[PDB]
Symmetry: D2
Subunit: 494 residues, 4 copies
């Protein structure tokens, strides 16, 4: 039971957040953020650039100074603050969910039940890690006492995308704050609003000034300034593989700041002939169409064994044809519009390429509404590995169904990609499941399920889908700088 | 008790090692490797370039294929192989120590008692880790069974320096092989001999073909080919900060391969007025002059509290003057020549800058011999923070002694650097020791000691001294790719 | 810092047996009185649980632990949510619980409020974070197999606690147990059952499924022994005397081989080196001994002082002991309340006479401090020798022992020459002396330049006969986990 | 292929091992050890009692004193010593395998290929743990620095059984010595020889005097003296559930020494209808009959689904009838004699009980030879849960086959036992495998296999099958005493 939404939530925050205060861009410039459902401007937002990032980094560095309130704060207390932040977010859950839908386009029911829930679970999970990421006492040779201190990496630049505005912010802040780091976050220009409101909650929660600084703005400007900053110790980025390369280059070209990347993919969803048909069809649908197809780990390569190909395709088409597209604020809406005009056009371009290359168009393929950025649920059959839609990340409601014969064959085809974010296996057989999960070159391998995320379980990509992991205990690794202290002792004993 | 060395050890390996076989460079080109003590050529060595690296990567990739001998091998057996390799290196200890000295220049007594001992301890330590780096079973929400597999990152490109040829090879091979990875190693052009002989021992130990491949050659050629290779999954580099930046940029500009760096420093060695004078003086001497001053973590900024400054300096100068420079094969030799002419000239250049800038030359200052790359143990007193010799890594037998008054002052001065590899504190006071070890922004802080390395304790730098850590359990992190497997289960129970 | 005014006569709302989130009278309908140690008067009667009541509690716990039950299926993260909720409810009723603790126990209200309750909240909140983080392992075993371990709950946990820290001991037990999905049958101390029973009401209010936590107030040889000997209790955690510790382990072995962890007493040495900060060491040595009316398991009951500073250290310690305010625990000026009961009161008086009889120099106190209640004067014995009974046995009262020593090698030997090894401390400014001593001392916790510094993050437990196993920190989860290895045959094992 | 065995290996050690020396019992008494294949006395062995244990404990205590050679020894060197012992054991493998067979009765081929191999793997695995079991640095509240030291528990009393003499000794010594503890081992009166010979190797390997002391003798005498000793810090026992209780009572009655127990069981081996018939039959045979049925985790309750019951039974009887029983030194022998006359008669008694209670005798059931303790491979069909042979541990070549219908039924019947050491599931279905592995109350659950031991994976029982775990990292826990050191610092920072 979801509370009735305010289909027109008021915007209270639209500036640059530094030292728990709101500031206009030094240039005084602003940029519009659009409601993808109507194509209308919601409001103006401060356009942060290099100079604003500089102010943000200085504030973060000051908050990270030895002896500061944030540095002296008990680890357990950082946990207390993260829990308080989660409580505040829960209080304002109905509002944030509506605002998320307004600025992003995803169905309100999904914003409320899925996104906001995961945000709360991520923040509360990491709050528990605050005073538990122990260093080590080491039995080194000789008369010495050796141990390690798990110190904060320092000033962390965090650049996030627009597909899960609130969630991406939580996946970043959770681990960083739990370990005592300070943040300079650059939210996506397409979805800056919700993250900015949470900044107000961060101040209300009690976090010292400068611990979390948010700079809304464009990528080549604000984003690059963070990645190239001489005083940013670490950068965490989630987005396109293309910009991931730019980030890494900027890091190497500047102060050698530590880097972790969460990029895209072309994840293979493998359906074996012994899989539960009804379950696999529904899960394959969800795997691809979830969040308007705007998911990094989307099951965009649906491999189906020949014996069950026809039936699976028929059922998948029927499911795609009945998928409700419309106003994200209407409870019956399963799919809202795409984030912006650029994505809208790019997706339509991919559908055209799909038709041109010989992929069999089974349903959809065009615009779903005359207003907004709505696209019809599209399904392509008889897709070949060499096809563009079978290789490139579409990031829209466009499903690819491929046919295979043997298990050995599908492993090779699934792995024949520059991406490796995720994969899935649908089978009732124990050996097939273990054979495939071990063989698949992907960060996450789901068996008889898809898009199952847990704050306890790490997520990240193999190959060019990224480096490093987020969520779980692993999510703390990149936010820790290790110091070894080796002390001479009179006489070491076991 | 050190066995009498063969002052002219025969060279058996001087080619490119691929698939457990010796090959000439595709171009058939060779480069000379010089004996720094005499300036004479030892022998010619195959000059590996891009085409040779390509062959090496393909061999490594083949050896890493699923179902291959190396992939199927029990983790405990990889441990058995590492132990076997250690035994073979111990069998040929006297020979390797002599060859190390011949090619590098360091005293034979040191090569035998220190370098070789550390190589053996490193390999035997990692041998034990082979079957103990567990993944995790995670209590994720919902009806799921979630766990992680700690798989090998893959084809690892390993680029190492010339200061500790065998030890650097060990620090790289140990963690990589322990975790089931395959290697393409680029040894330093100044010291390729000892590493090539070890390749023979790797074959003798029983490691499958392609598991370890070694390509001797230059940096911009062979090294850059590895860093930019589209099929290399991870690169580990040890060397200058300048080239470290080049490596990270190459990785980002290519296939987003994972990166870890071990660069230089300008490590501060702080002597508080309550320190044991005799011990502090001897340790500070060792901290700087060890291995001809060619140590990444050399104590190149000796901070001495004003009350004991004069006495400390007087004793330091006396010790530097008594240091025996000469033939590394002579038991009485404490300091051999610098690695090559380039380093020789660079050091003399820094000494000149020290004189030009007003630092007080207290002893040494020039060449120590008319043949070979020998430099006199040099000590500069009254060094100021703004001086070139106080900021840049000299990598030679040139000591800088600075004066300070308060503990608060020295912390700021010690940390005022783009480097942060190591640091040391000499004091008898508990509080001062804890205050300093916590406040110093350095990868390793030594208290009442220096250059105390243990295979069990991690080593790495803060800031621009590098990223990631080697040695200890931490050394396994960069050689692991994490995979999450999440399986739907009938009903999850605790 | 600031403390809300206490209700010096807090109303008692819970005084029965807690099973399946409901209150029950003992099957026998028997009740026992709990006394206010400050006045010696009866506060109220409490249901007297016995074997038959324990059996019911164990059966309820077993049912709550059945596969498919709400508590077994509950997401680990949610168990953490429930623990945080319980902590919030305890904080809401902090002032009430602080006063009730003082009424039943006797400790100063200011301490119950600022110390005990604070530590309770911190313990529960720490463990809530552990709920979904105590991972099992995936193991690189030889051959074509996939091997891993599940960290399952040990099962029905019997927890028997003492009276010196009623609420805190309850929290130290519940936190790790609930965080790991176990169920509990807790036997609170007969001298202080009230606060734990009220917390049961908060456990129900928090949302814990019925049977997850069951509390049986009653005596030791009856209710406590029934838990230790129970054929369906999988694990027992006990805190109290070394003697009952042995009885518990024997009962475990003679019954179903239930797993056992013990937190017993000690005769903890507090070593003061000649280079220590005098003022700091004196104040800390006083605290180390006299805290909680000297009723602390890890009390620094053997104060070793280096000869060169002995005279001055003693003079300052005596003056500090003489200035210690003894009186009504509800009065803000009060530093020391009464001992927990008449039995302890008499036992301490006996040890004081024992000290005088064996030759220890009585420096101050040594008698009854008040006509009513169980108040004892802060007592200090000087020139104590290792062979004295007051130097060997746990007094558990406001009785300090000061011993003199010369060298660091000597003090290590004397401090370790004991059947106890719960804790120890070292006061020195020297790096080497601190490292030499912390390594050499055979104790569970070694404090350097401090004492009684507990952290929910750091393990606590004894060496030798001071106990086995550890509580608090990550280590506190070990005893509440039963490890299962699952080894599956796979087509072809690859790294 | 296995080397030719010396069918009558010379006995070199038969006394009490204390301080790396051989002693007779204080009472000068000895006891005979018998060859179970002929019933003939091999030799006399010193009968250790309380006074001998007292001498061993004092020696162990002395070796454990602070500052002793064993206490000061580098953790890494303890690993070196364990690896050396393994090497000596491997050098004398042919001899030890033959001696094991002579004293125990198990087939020489198995002693050589299985027992000795596992002994080597156990010691080599733990050798690797010596310097890797780290303590922690903890982020405690307030201005303190808190850390934990993982110290050795101290003097460890280790009492082991006769079913796997050498292996049981290795499972105890490996973890204990890896963590720096000292040992007073009490070997089984039925099989003291091999352990005593290894004591010689322990001395030859270089372990300091008193680190390992071995006292051969009886249970109520030497064993009980160890369990009740006032100066033994920890006791690890493997044997019967009955004596396990006696050990725990002794510990509680004495000095509260820490306790871990590895007892027996009545492990259920579950065969679902979709299991691989051939594989399940051979594995079920192995599961029960392995080691003359003298295995703690023997699959003595073979549950078979009704649909495949008749066929499974027919194949199981045929396999049991073909099992070769005879001279353990003959390469064709699969089953040697039982350990002694006591066990021999106990098993026959159980077989008679099985017949009286209504179980269907399908094959065997009697003595297999007129000399030695040989018993025919016996199989009972239509066994019911209430039958004595279905509840009590037989420890002989007596198989129980029960029929079941549903999965919920088999899980409940399998769990309806006071034991819970191990269990197994044979099925091709993923969900069935996961459901059973989770629901079964057993220390180890094998899936599509049985008796798969790995030094890397823990082993131990649920309920009355024991407490604590051996093998893996978990095996180190009981050998560690944890010490927390909390230090006041001037100002704590993250
Ligand atoms: N951190 C260290 O341990 C360390 C080691 C050696 C040198 N140094 C520093 O570096 C200074 C210069 O010495 P150097 O030139 O021999 O160090 P370097 O960084 O140039 O060489 C290190 C390794 O990287 C390879 N390399 C060089 N250029 C490369 C490139 N363009 N792409 C890929 N790999 C490349 C080299 O061949 C060698 O194998 C030294 O004086 C000292 O200050 C530091
Ligand atoms: Mg872009
Ligand atoms: Mg260079
Ligand atoms: Mg009592
Ligand atoms: Mg017996
Ligand atoms: Na928008
Ligand atoms: Na050279
Ligand atoms: Na009371
Ligand atoms: Na025998």
């Amino acid at each position: 039971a979801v509370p009735a939404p305010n289909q027109q939530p008021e915007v209270f925050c639209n500036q640059i957040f530094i030292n728990n205060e709101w500031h206009d861009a030094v240039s005084r410039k602003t940029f519009p953020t659009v409601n993808p459902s109507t194509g209308e401007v919601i409001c103006q937002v401060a356009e942060g650039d290099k100079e604003d990032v500089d102010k943000a980094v200085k504030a973060a560095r000051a908050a990270f100074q030895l002896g500061s309130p944030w540095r002296r704060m008990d680890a357990s207390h950082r946990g207390r603050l993260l829990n308080r932040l989660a409580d505040l977010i829960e209080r304002d859950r109905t509002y944030l969910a509506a605002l998320e839908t307004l600025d992003n386009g995803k169905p309100y029911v999904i914003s409320y039940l899925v996104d906001l829930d995961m945000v709360l679970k991520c923040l509360r999970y990491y709050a528990g890690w605050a005073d538990k990421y122990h260093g080590k006492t080491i039995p080194i040779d000789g008369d010495f006492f050796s141990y390690t201190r798990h110190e904060p990496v320092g000033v962390c630049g965090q650049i996030i995308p627009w597909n899960f505005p609130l969630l991406m912010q939580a996946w970043k802040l959770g681990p960083a704050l739990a370990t005592g780091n300070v943040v300079v976050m650059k939210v996506a220009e397409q979805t800056p609003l919700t993250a900015l409101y949470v900044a107000n909650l961060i101040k209300e929660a009690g976090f010292p000034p400068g611990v979390v600084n948010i700079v809304p703005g464009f990528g080549p400007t604000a984003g690059a300034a963070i990645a190239s900053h001489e005083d940013v110790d670490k950068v965490a980025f989630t987005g396109s593989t293309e910009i991931g390369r730019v980030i890494q280059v900027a890091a190497g070209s500047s102060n050698l700041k530590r880097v972790t990347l969460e990029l895209g993919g072309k994840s293979p969803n493998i359906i074996m002939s012994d899989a539960d048909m009804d379950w696999a069809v529904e899960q394959a649908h969800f795997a691809l169409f979830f969040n308007q197809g705007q998911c990094c780990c989307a099951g965009s390569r649906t491999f189906v064994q020949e014996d069950i190909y026809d039936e699976f395709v028929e059922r998948s088409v029927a499911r795609a044809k009945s998928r409700v597209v419309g106003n994200p604020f209407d409870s019956k809406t399963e799919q809202g519009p795409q984030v912006d005009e650029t994505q809208f056009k790019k997706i339509l371009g991919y559908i055209n390429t799909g038709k041109q290359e010989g992929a069999k168009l089974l349903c959809g393929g065009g615009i779903a509404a005359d207003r907004g950025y709505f696209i019809q649920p599209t399904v392509f059959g008889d897709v070949q590995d060499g096809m563009t839609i079978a290789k490139e990340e579409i990031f829209g409601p466009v499903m690819q169904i491929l046919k295979f014969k043997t298990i050995e064959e599908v492993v090779g085809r699934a792995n024949n990609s520059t991406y490796g974010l995720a994969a899935a296996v649908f089978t009732k057989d124990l050996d097939k499941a273990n054979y495939l999960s071990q063989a698949l070159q992907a960060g996450t391998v789901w068996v008889n399920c898809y898009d199952v995320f847990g704050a306890q379980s790490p997520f990240g990509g193999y190959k060019m889908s990224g480096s490093g992991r987020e969520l779980g205990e692993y999510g703390l690794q990149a936010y820790t700088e290790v110091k070894t202290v080796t002390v001479k002792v009179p006489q070491k004993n076991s």
